[PDB]
Amino acid sequence: IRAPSHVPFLLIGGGTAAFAAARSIRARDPGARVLIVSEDPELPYMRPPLSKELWFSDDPNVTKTLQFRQWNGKERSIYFQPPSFYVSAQDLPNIENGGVAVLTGKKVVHLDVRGNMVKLNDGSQITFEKCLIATGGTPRSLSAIDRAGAEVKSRTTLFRKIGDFRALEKISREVKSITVIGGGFLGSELACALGRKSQASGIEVIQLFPEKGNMGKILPQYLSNWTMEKVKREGVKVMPNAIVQSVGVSGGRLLIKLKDGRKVETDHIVTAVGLEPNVELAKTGGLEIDSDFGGFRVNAELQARSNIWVAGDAACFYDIKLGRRRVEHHDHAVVSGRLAGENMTGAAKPYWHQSMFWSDLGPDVGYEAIGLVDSSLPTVGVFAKATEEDYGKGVIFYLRDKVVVGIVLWNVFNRMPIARKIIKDGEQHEDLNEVAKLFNIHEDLVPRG
């Protein structure tokens, strides 16, 4: 198939961000002609299931069907839409009322900003009227793994793509011990996914990380510790305060020697130690990178230059209330993609509507969260007490200048609107205990996810 020489809407990076954009473009301006160029050969799909929902599928054909049952009991696929609902790259600049074409297995390798053109890996060039960068990002590798030999390197996976899941699902039924390095969102979610699978398979599940407790970059120590202990229950050997020093191959099995001196024998390793943005095209185009936050530097309306927007994880925008930041969540990729698409069609409206995130670590831990959630800030957790400490349920406020900037709804569900208001308001509330009463914590509420 041949690429169209020109297209009005070019979305570099066929992920969760690109899809929202194209959907929002098609919506705001009907009969749009949108081309998503995606280095990935898979059509746009959502990632959350790959750490959570697809590991709990009873159907053993899950690795092939890539379906799951939503917390509402309805069954769906991780793909945003089926192939039939995309037009072809060939037929895009003709088909009546345009549509969305996805160019699978094609990387943009140069962004000619001045001339409104991209050059593809295969030479073929495509000009655009409006362009969005939605390159997302690639998972960070652990230094120690890089330094080690290719024997150990070959037995180390990272997690992002579909194949990552499909291969680690196999490896879960093969080895006797899997060690996850890193205490991240993903770290924990995989450790708990494998932990639940181990209830039947009996496999050793180890998770080690340098923090004192799980999710130590977004949870305050007490909760962080408590969450670690709840992960433990799901079937995980958790080793906090683990700084890896070197990983060799001892006895046909990977040996992880920590700086504190502890050794760990295991068969396979999965590093979930953070995400690096795919800011490749920055140099080619002369677009700015946030020195502090990483990713492309875009203004309040996710705009970089006259005809270039950025969204998703790759985008470091200016949140008019919370300040400049880059956020790497799923609802963020969607919200920002939506907005970019609006602005591309000419709305020029700023990021006002907040994006959020959620994680579920077993049945005991499930939290929606909004805005500036960063364990380094001062927190005020308000939890429910009974009628030997139970942080089972409550709400945690994140402060900056005596102003709430982030909230974590701890096992409190369907309350995100209320929280959202509190962020908008950014009042200097004398007592946050009152503000907490707004979330009817003690009340059973709804048990989504």
Partner: peptide, 18 residues
């Protein structure tokens, strides 16, 4: 109203009664 301050993080427990 068990309120206790642990560094930067402040922890308030409450029992529903209002």
């Amino acid at each position: 109203s068990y309120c206790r301050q642990e560094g930067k993080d402040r922890i308030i427990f409450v029992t529903k009664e209002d």
